[PDB]
């Protein structure tokens, strides 16, 4: 008979005989998982002493009460600051001692 021949499907380290090999359209479904989450939380910020001016170093005692792995930015003080440590890990009770010229 005018046939191509027998079929064998080899699929990722296997050798399998098909009773019926074919393609067809099927009725299916799809799912979705909502994106986004949000966080906020009180932090203790205190100032032991200050030596701001032109000199880069200052003594600032701020803390965090949070658990998030990824830490966001931080900000500056008056008279044009940009703290060398804006992002610093926020998982555990790790205080942050910044530097300024205020």
């Amino acid at each position: 008979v005018h046939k191509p021949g027998e079929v064998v499907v080899s699929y990722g380290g296997m050798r399998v005989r098909p009773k019926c090999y074919g393609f067809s359209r099927m009725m299916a479904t799809m799912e979705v998982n909502p994106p986004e989450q949000r966080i906020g939380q009180c932090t203790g910020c205190h100032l032991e002493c200050i030596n701001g001016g032109v000199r880069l170093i200052t003594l600032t005692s701020e803390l965090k009460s949070a658990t998030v792995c990824a830490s966001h930015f931080c900000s500056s003080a008056t008279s044009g600051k940009k703290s060398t440590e804006i992002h610093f890990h926020s998982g555990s009770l790790v205080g942050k001692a910044a530097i300024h010229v205020k």
């Binding site: 046939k3 191509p4 021949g5 393609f23 990824a70 500056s76 003080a77 008056t78 008279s79 044009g80 600051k81 940009k82």
Partner: protein, 296 residues
């Protein structure tokens, strides 16, 4: 505010829509000096009538060096998969001379034409096994048809832009006289014109400039971190660059289905055998191929 400049109210056209409180509409141009960082600058408004007037406060926050996204492109994580349907001659009846024309999208050989999970993979015949070993008893050889997929099971996507420049810019907050507060980032080293409401801010003094090599930014959609590289980019993927697949829809950046994104000739590693073809690849990951820094 320490530095303050009043308007030029000589443009006078006010319609007395209400008698208790007046109304007026005006425009013009102004030249106010740059304020020190961390402070706000003012702008005084005057009217020919005495009692009423308003103000406008322009607050600066930061000075830094960013560059503008002249373009934008997405990069998926390519993988190379390849199938093989192996007819033999007089049973696939495929032409003695392999048809030099190849239909790269349908593939009527295996289920007519449908959506292809590859982005324009190629086609071809091959050399032919024939005889008792391959078992279909014809002497003459057999053509084999092969596919290549550029695929992405669980991608991590990067959007990139080749500014290839660095000019000072700042952070601005604005105070409409009504009481609105709208934020934006003006590229005030370049005479860019950002549009909002009624006003537009523009250039400042480039009191210091610096030079730097051909580098530009790499960012991740899950936001692993931010990365820097030589970061070559153009309309096409040049040899040896960071970005090969350059694809222009985030919602279509998971799979490879939008036409906008553009392949490389013979990029995927298809190689043949006596029975069927196997997959390899020569693509390079973004990391550790040409990396000159890593952001703290």
């Amino acid at each position: 505010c320490d530095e303050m400049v009043h308007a030029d109210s000589k443009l006078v056209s006010c319609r007395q829509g209400s008698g208790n409180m007046k109304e007026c509409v005006t425009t013009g141009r102004a030249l106010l000096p740059a304020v020190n960082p961390g402070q706000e600058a003012c702008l005084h408004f005057t009217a020919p009538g005495s009692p009423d007037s308003k103000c406008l406060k322009i607050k600066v926050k930061r000075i830094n060096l960013k560059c503008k996204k002249s373009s934008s492109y997405f990069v998926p994580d390519a993988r190379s998969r390849c199938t093989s349907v192996r007819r033999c001659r007089w049973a696939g009846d495929c032409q003695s001379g392999c048809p030099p024309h190849f239909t790269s999208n349908s593939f009527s050989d295996d289920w007519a034409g449908k959506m292809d999970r590859a982005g324009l993979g190629f086609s071809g015949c091959s050399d032919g096994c024939g005889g008792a070993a391959c078992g279909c008893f014809n002497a003459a050889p057999s053509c084999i048809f092969w596919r290549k997929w550029v695929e992405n099971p669980h991608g991590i996507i990067w959007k990139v832009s080749p500014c290839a420049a660095w000019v000072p810019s700042a952070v601005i907050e604005l105070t409409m006289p009504s009481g609105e507060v709208r934020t934006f980032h003006p590229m005030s080293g370049i005479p860019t014109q950002v549009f909002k409401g009624v006003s537009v801010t523009y250039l400042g003094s480039d009191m210091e400039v610096s030079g730097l090599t051909d580098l530009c930014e790499i960012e991740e959609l899950k936001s692993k971190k931010l990365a820097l590289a030589p970061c070559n980019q153009a309309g096409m993927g040049v040899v040896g660059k960071v970005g090969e697949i350059q694809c222009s829809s985030e919602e279509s950046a998971r799979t490879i289905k939008k036409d906008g994104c553009i392949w490389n000739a013979d990029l995927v590693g298809i190689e043949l055998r006596v029975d069927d073809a196997v997959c390899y690849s020569k693509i390079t990951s973004v990391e550790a191929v040409a990396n000159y820094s890593a952001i703290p």
